[PDB]
Amino acid sequence: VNSHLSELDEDVFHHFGFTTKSFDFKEKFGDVKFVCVCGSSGRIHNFAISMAKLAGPVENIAGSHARFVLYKVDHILFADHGMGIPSALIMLHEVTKLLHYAGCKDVLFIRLGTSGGLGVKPGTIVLSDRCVNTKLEPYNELCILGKPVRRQTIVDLNTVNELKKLSENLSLECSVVVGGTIAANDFYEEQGRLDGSICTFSKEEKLAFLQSAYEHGIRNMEMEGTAITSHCYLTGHRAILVCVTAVNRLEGDQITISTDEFTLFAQRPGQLVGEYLKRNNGII
Amino acid sequence: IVNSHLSELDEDVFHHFGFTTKSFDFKEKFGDVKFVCVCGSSGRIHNFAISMAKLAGVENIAGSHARFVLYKVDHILFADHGMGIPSALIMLHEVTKLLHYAGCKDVLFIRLGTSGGLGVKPGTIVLSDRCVNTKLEPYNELCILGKPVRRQTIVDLNTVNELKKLSENLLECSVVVGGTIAANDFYEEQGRLDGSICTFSKEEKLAFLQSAYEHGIRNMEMEGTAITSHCYLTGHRAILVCVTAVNRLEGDQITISTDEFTLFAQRPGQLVGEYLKRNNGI
Numbered sequence: 001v002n003s004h005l006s007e008l009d010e011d012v013f014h015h016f017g018f019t020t021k022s023f024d025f026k027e028k029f030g031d032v033k034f035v036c037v038c039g040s041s042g043r044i045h046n047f048a049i050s051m052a053k054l055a056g057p058v059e060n061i062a063g064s065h066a067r068f069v070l071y072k073v074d075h076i077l078f079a080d081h082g083m084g085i086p087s088a089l090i091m092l093h094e095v096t097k098l099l100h101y102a103g104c105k106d107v108l109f110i111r112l113g114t115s116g117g118l119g120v121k122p123g124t125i126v127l128s129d130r131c132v133n134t135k136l137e138p139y140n141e142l143c144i145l146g147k148p149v150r151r152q153t154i155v156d157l158n159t160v161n162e163l164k165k166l167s168e169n170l171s172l173e174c175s176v177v178v179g180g181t182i183a184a185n186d187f188y189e190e191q192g193r194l195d196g197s198i199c200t201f202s203k204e205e206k207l208a209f210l211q212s213a214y215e216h217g218i219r220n221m222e223m224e225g226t227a228i229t230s231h232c233y234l235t236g237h238r239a240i241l242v243c244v245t246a247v248n249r250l251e252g253d254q255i256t257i258s259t260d261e262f263t264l265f266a267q268r269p270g271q272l273v274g275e276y277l278k279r280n281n282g283i284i
Numbered sequence: 285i286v287n288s289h290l291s292e293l294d295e296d297v298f299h300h301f302g303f304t305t306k307s308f309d310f311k312e313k314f315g316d317v318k319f320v321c322v323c324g325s326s327g328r329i330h331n332f333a334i335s336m337a338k339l340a341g342v343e344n345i346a347g348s349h350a351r352f353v354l355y356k357v358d359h360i361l362f363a364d365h366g367m368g369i370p371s372a373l374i375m376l377h378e379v380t381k382l383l384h385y386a387g388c389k390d391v392l393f394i395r396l397g398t399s400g401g402l403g404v405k406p407g408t409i410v411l412s413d414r415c416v417n418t419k420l421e422p423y424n425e426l427c428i429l430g431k432p433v434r435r436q437t438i439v440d441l442n443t444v445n446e447l448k449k450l451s452e453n454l455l456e457c458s459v460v461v462g463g464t465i466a467a468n469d470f471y472e473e474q475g476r477l478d479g480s481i482c483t484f485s486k487e488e489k490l491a492f493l494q495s496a497y498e499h500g501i502r503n504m505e506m507e508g509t510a511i512t513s514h515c516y517l518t519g520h521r522a523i524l525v526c527v528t529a530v531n532r533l534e535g536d537q538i539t540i541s542t543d544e545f546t547l548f549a550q551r552p553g554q555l556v557g558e559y560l561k562r563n564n565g566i
């Protein structure tokens with residue numbers, strides 16, 4: 001626990017647009033044991049109402065001019081985190097502080113994102129069994145006061161296993177695969193795309209990178225994994241990634257699937273996790 | 285200077301903007317663009333476009349379910365970039381590809397963001413004369429194909445000088461020209477003690493922020509090094525015009541009200557808007 005939080009009479013959650021004085025956190029959020037997050041505010045809101053209908057209109061808890069949205073259904077908190085580790089870390093710091101003030105222990109963070117697939121069919125759900133950087137290292141890197149810091153990523157494998165076994169008892173119109181996940185600090189160059197505004201490498205060099213990743217167990221590629229699975233473990237919580245793929249990066253770079261098909265693909269992680277939450281006291 | 289792989293594509297999908305090269309006639313529709321104004325909020329960047337439009341003589345060009353928004357007022361483009369370098373780089377890659385397809389050359393990018401101030405009053409407009417990382421290095425760091433890559437940051441100092449002179453002829457707040465730190469986190473990397481995790485003392489914190497100030501740093505945000513390194517590499521120009529919402533030499537919390545934050549956040553727009561008016565922006 002950060003000692004300095006006690007010094008504050010009031011703690012302002014700038015990006016969520018509320019403070020500790022806005023409501024009683026223990027009474028408001030104390031029952032929360034699941035936190036579901038994704039890059040889109042619209043999609044996470046769409047997953048939220050889905051859970052609410054299963055449980056029994058979901059209203060935004062966050063402020064009007066806030067950067068992020070915040071929803072609650074029974075023991076589940078819903079929030080968006082934008083794109084990239086820095087933005088995710090903003091969400092992570094303020095949500096985990098929220099859990100602290102609320103008296104929430106051993107909460108499971110679940111990221112429901114989209115990703116580029118490696119050697120898998122588009123629309124495939126990938127359960128990360130590890131989150132690594134572009135060098136396939138199981139760490140998130142930070143620079144604190146100008147000093148280099150590394151924090152190892154820890155995926156909740158027991159929950160991953162339960163999710164995999166659940167998918168076998170379900171009839172989802174897609175595959176559920178357990179495999180590693182690369183987090184990158186860019187959508188184009190760092191992910192080895194050839195169709196960025198800048199490209200300093202060849203197709204051959206690209207495939208050598210992606211193929212090597214695939215043969216190392218990597219099945220998808222996104223932009224927040226290493227932050228989430230490092231931060232939560234360090235704050236006494238658990239984290240998993242449940243991401244659908246929108247393209248097979250071993251074949252292409254472009255997102256060629258239609259807007260409708262993408263929406264349907266993006267809704268697939270919610271199908272699995274939503275059933276998981278229903279069966280694991282996420283909702284009543 | 286030009287990524288050759290682009291020509292190999294029959295159609296280019298701007299995934300995060302929700303359109304393609306077959307959506308419009310890029311040379312015809314955007315060929316005139318000489319300005320691109322960006323910030324982290326879609327709501328704010330739209331309002332600034334609305335303010336520019338009324339000043340000129342706004343509808344979203346981006347897709348309905350797209351990550352970013354896109355507006356165009358005369359020779360100016362408007363788009364959001366979310367928060368942080370990776371999010372900015374997504375905006376930067378797809379916008380600069382748009383410009384490439386449109387035949388736009390030597391475009392000035394203008395980031396109108398918010399920031400934490402150093403040694404300056406809250407509400408101060410800081411004109412970046414340099415953008416550096418947390419180690420005060422004028423570079424953006426990337427890991428491309430698992431390999432370390434460094435790209436130097438270059439601010440359009442000529443435009444910066446002109447902006448300062450313009451502000452002197454307009455401005456209740458101060459307009460300061462100083463260095464700007466880009467950080468990959470709002471809390472720990474920015475030396476805040478009020479994050480969920482804190483591994484340093486205030487003595488080490490003060491030493492860090494004070495040693496930044498005396499090095500000419502006046503504010504701190506999260507996208508600078510990305511923008512001022514990417515645009516130069518793509519043959520374009522970039523500046524940062526960011527308001528401060530707190531004096532980090534005094535505290536970490538954003539204690540000002542939402543209304544006051546909104547007023548502060550609209551201040552860069554006020555200065556930039558006039559500049560654009562007097563430099564054939566509208």
Ligand SMILES: Cc1c[nH]c(=O)[nH]c1=O
Nearest residue numbers: 114115116221222223246
């Ligand atoms: C489809 C996709 C989503 N997010 C990523 O980071 N990469 C991708 O390829």
Ligand SMILES: Cc1c[nH]c(=O)[nH]c1=O
Nearest residue numbers: 398399400504505506529
């Ligand atoms: C107010 C503020 C905005 N953006 C930042 O990156 N830091 C800050 O302190």
